[PDB]
Design an enzyme around this catalytic site. Structure first.
Site, PDB file in Angstrom:
ATOM      1  N   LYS A  92       0.900  -1.122   0.087  1.00 40.90           N
ATOM      2  CA  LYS A  92      -0.099   0.169   0.013  1.00 40.90           C
ATOM      3  C   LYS A  92       0.762   1.279   0.115  1.00 40.90           C
ATOM      4  CE  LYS A  92      -4.556  -1.421   1.374  1.00 40.90           C
ATOM      5  NZ  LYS A  92      -5.401  -2.042   2.228  1.00 40.90           N
ATOM      6  N   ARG A 108      -3.966 -10.222   4.173  1.00 41.46           N
ATOM      7  CA  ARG A 108      -4.352 -10.466   2.711  1.00 41.46           C
ATOM      8  C   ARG A 108      -3.087  -9.531   1.926  1.00 41.46           C
ATOM      9  NH1 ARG A 108      -6.248  -6.529  -0.925  1.00 41.46           N
ATOM     10  NH2 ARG A 108      -8.079  -7.360  -2.197  1.00 41.46           N
TER      11      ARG A 108
HETATM   12  C1  LIG Z   1      -7.403  -2.191  -1.405  1.00 38.35           C
HETATM   13  C2  LIG Z   1      -7.816  -3.522  -0.930  1.00 38.35           C
HETATM   14  C3  LIG Z   1      -9.314  -3.779  -1.316  1.00 38.35           C
HETATM   15  N1  LIG Z   1     -10.027  -4.810  -0.655  1.00 38.35           N
HETATM   16  C4  LIG Z   1      -9.542  -5.132   0.752  1.00 38.35           C
HETATM   17  N2  LIG Z   1     -10.243  -6.072   1.519  1.00 38.35           N
HETATM   18  C5  LIG Z   1      -9.865  -5.957   2.937  1.00 38.35           C
HETATM   19  N3  LIG Z   1     -10.479  -7.077   3.620  1.00 38.35           N
HETATM   20  N4  LIG Z   1      -8.770  -5.588   3.496  1.00 38.35           N
HETATM   21  C6  LIG Z   1      -8.087  -4.545   2.761  1.00 38.35           C
HETATM   22  O1  LIG Z   1      -7.268  -3.982   2.962  1.00 38.35           O
HETATM   23  C7  LIG Z   1      -8.603  -4.214   1.258  1.00 38.35           C
HETATM   24  N5  LIG Z   1      -7.602  -3.383   0.588  1.00 38.35           N
END
Ligand SMILES: C[C@@H]1CNc2nc(N)[nH]c(=O)c2N1
Ligand SMILES: C[C@@H]1CNc2nc(N)[nH]c(=O)c2N1
Lengths: 265, 265
Positions: free
Chosen positions: B211, B245
């Site tokens: 990020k 994630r």
């Molecule tokens: C940019 C992405 C979009 N989807 C996501 N989903 C979760 N749970 N957590 C997240 O941080 C994100 N970030």
């Protein structure tokens, strides 16, 4: 938090600003102060200076050696690196005479894996030149009543020896000695309770780079241990360590630096 | 610590045994359920299954899109991956109809970046199919009185919505929403206080992969953020997160696993 700076003669290291990275200089000998070995070592220090290292750690006897010889191998290296690379140099010996020569030759910090216990005279060497000294936990046995309580007792026996010989508190750094005198499970227990060493009042250096307990967890050889070392550096910094001793200087500097930002150091 | 398992119909995820790795499926569209896109996605899921991922996260609208369309892009992908890769699939939408179709097509977990606030009807979709749902912190503004206290208030407003619609506590997972509605400094403050979300009584998923705040600290582009992501995964796991994630599944699985060994999970 630290009310003083680490005085290294020519260089000064601030303990509050960031986690300080100690680069491990691989001292691959020639079969013979030769050129290929002193030049391969100078280029390696330079690479690590450029990758974000704050201290270069130079060792004569890599565990996996006569006293007279350890000096002839390590003294040329310290001369070339301290002249050609503007970083403090720590000398990774437990032998008092080796430490003595190394500092004459230009090293700034003593790095003693036996915490002044193998050769107590080394702390007198430290007391005299007035250099910082790392006291690492080690023992010639692995029978712990209570691992952490014993580490802390043992480290404290190093401090006494150091202080008795004239070492100022401000020149004492401690090290849990990960991978020494500890089973793989004891190594992970020391990691999980690292913050306990903070009660002794001294800065802590952590050395976990590529060590056998990482291999035991991940089931991976020494060259596949970069992620596992990262995890140990991260937990170490969060538990309060002031220094980490690593081979992968580029990668660990970045992980260090991101940890620092997050924990607010 | 968790007195229940995460029920995902066909698959069950244990919350105590290890940090669970959610692999981010890059859904690079064709200019046109085409082969190159469904096949590039199946091979990518397979690579991540082989690198140690426990859940595949599939998204229709990547932030950097008509409802009817989001379904036509994502439904073929879920069918191919759920048939060809034996992992639970989460569907990264906030739209109730998209979520509905995705689950018919084979997805197991809902992943809602607006925590049931953009389209409250999505929690009814969750309540009905009886699937786990991730409620992520987000807001359409960045004026925090107290960042953490506000996150916790806001998350709790998602839980109410979810619970009111019929969602069982055991199907609720929370997410601090790192990189959403937060300045770079707020992102590092949420990281440093992540353990606060544990008081809500639910499992936490952390998403920090590559990020922009990592880039802000390290001053490094999206492809040089692997060490910085590692640091965030490590601090997250130490602060108690049940899931991370990530894009770099091989590297993060190893860092996850070494953290798990050390913190005793
Ligand atoms: C940019 C992405 C979009 N989807 C996501 N989903 C979760 N749970 N957590 C997240 O941080 C994100 N970030
Ligand atoms: C194997 C190496 C040898 N030298 C070291 N010195 C310190 N301080 N800390 C260490 O961990 C080590 N390990």
């Amino acid at each position: 938090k630290w009310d003083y700076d680490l005085r290294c003669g020519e260089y000064t290291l601030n303990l509050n600003e960031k986690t300080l990275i100690m680069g491990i200089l691989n001292v691959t000998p020639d079969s013979f102060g030769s050129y290929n070995e002193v030049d391969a070592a100078v280029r390696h220090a330079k690479e690590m200076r450029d990758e974000g290292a704050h201290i270069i750690d130079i060792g004569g006897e890599s565990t996996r050696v006569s006293v007279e010889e350890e000096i002839k191998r390590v003294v040329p290296m310290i001369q070339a690196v301290s002249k050609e690379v503007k970083l403090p140099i720590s000398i990774d010996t437990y032998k008092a005479e080796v430490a003595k020569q190394a500092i004459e030759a230009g090293a700034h910090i003593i790095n003693d894996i036996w915490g002044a216990k193998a050769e107590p005279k080394i702390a007198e060497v430290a007391a005299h030149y007035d250099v910082p000294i790392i006291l690492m936990h080690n023992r010639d046995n692995m029978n712990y009543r209570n691992l952490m309580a014993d580490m802390i007792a043992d480290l404290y026996d190093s401090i006494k020896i150091a202080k008795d010989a004239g070492v100022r508190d401000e020149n004492i750094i401690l090290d849990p000695g990960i991978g020494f005198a500890k089973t793989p499970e004891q190594n992970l227990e020391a990691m999980r309770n690292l913050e306990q060493l903070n009660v002794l009042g001294y800065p802590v250096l952590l050395g976990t780079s590529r060590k056998s307990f990482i291999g035991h967890v991940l089931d991976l050889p020494v060259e596949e241990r970069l992620e596992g070392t990262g995890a140990t550096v991260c937990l170490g910094i969060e538990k309060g360590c002031e220094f980490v001793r690593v081979h992968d200087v580029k990668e660990m500097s970045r992980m260090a630096k991101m940890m620092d930002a997050m924990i607010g150091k």
